Amino acid sequence: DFEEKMILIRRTARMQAGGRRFRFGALVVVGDRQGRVGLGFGKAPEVPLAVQKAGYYARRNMVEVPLQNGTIPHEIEVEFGASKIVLKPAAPGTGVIAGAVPRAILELAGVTDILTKELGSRNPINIAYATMEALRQLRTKADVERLRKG
RNA sequence: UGGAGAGUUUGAUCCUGGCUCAGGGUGAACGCUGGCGGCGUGCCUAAGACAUGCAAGUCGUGCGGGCCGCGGGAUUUUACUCCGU
Ligand SMILES: [Mg+2]
Ligand SMILES: [Mg+2]
Ligand SMILES: [Mg+2]
Ligand SMILES: [Mg+2]
Ligand SMILES: [Mg+2]
Ligand SMILES: [Mg+2]
């Protein structure tokens, strides 16, 4: 069992002959706070089945978060559409200084000291997606070494 | 040792994009309120106009006087004159 926080719920709507037709979208993170997180986007006729559905997709979509005591190996910037995130390593004592969206994601990978900036489009969905791509993109001294040995 | 963002264009969406808020600051002023103290601080406007008092003197160990005193002398005649203070 991982942890699970709901970042976002929204109600969307389509049109049909006489009246609009509502739907709900749910952004949910799940994490063991020990270097494993997942993002999930779940949509349904009702909030619950949606949230719940998110949960399910979150766990099916997971990342190696190579913590190095509270923080991440190095800096990364990732663009996702018009959304951009910068992630920066911090010495212990700082905290997760981030916006609600990536805070949630960082916290549940058990990151505790990180400096972030949201740049470009601040649309939650894409910020969240960038954050994940960013983490998914972190290497460590080891991995680099492996890559370059040959 | 250092970096958080949110609201608002649509029936809904993504994006551009402006407006707006959350923080910090001030020689402040204004409203309601107002107990004590220490340390700071107080014409940002007319370099407009200014009553009155005070804000730059001191040296008699550089010099000679004037005015008000006091005291000594010369003459034994009282006026005149010398010295000290
Ligand atoms: Mg771009
Ligand atoms: Mg923008
Ligand atoms: Mg409006
Ligand atoms: Mg329009
Ligand atoms: Mg509307
Ligand atoms: Mg905007």
Domain that holds residue A115: 65-139
- State the resolution, in angstroms: 3.1
> Residue with CA nearest B15 C1'?
A82
Is A75 in the same domain as A128? yes
Q: How many Å lie between the centroid of ligand 2 and the Cα of residue A70? A: 31
Which method was used? X-ray
The residue type of A132 is M
Q: Note whether residue A39 is domain-resident.
A: yes
Is A82 in the same domain as A41? no
What letter does residue A144 receive in the DSSP assignment?
H
Q: Say how far apart CA A79 and CA A17 lie, in whole Å.
A: 40
Asked if strand B contacts A126 at the CB level, meaning under 7 A, the answer is yes
By the 10 Å C-beta count (0-12 exposed, 13-18 middle, 19+ buried), A11 is classed as exposed
CA A81 to each of CA A12, A39, A75, A91, A136: distance values in angstroms, whole numbers, following the listed order:
21, 17, 20, 31, 17
Q: Say how far apart CA A107 and CA A99 lie, in whole Å.
A: 11
CA A77 to each of CA A5, A47, A55, A107, A149: distance values in angstroms, whole numbers, following the listed order:
24, 33, 27, 18, 26
CATH number at residue A109: 3.30.230.10
Q: Say how far apart CA A66 and CA A98 lie, in whole Å.
A: 19
Q: Which residues of A46-63 are buried (b: 16+ CB within 10 A; e: fewer)?
A: eeeebbebbbebbeeebb
Distance from residue A34 (CA) to nucleotide B35 (C1'), in Å? 56
Tokens of A148: 């370059």
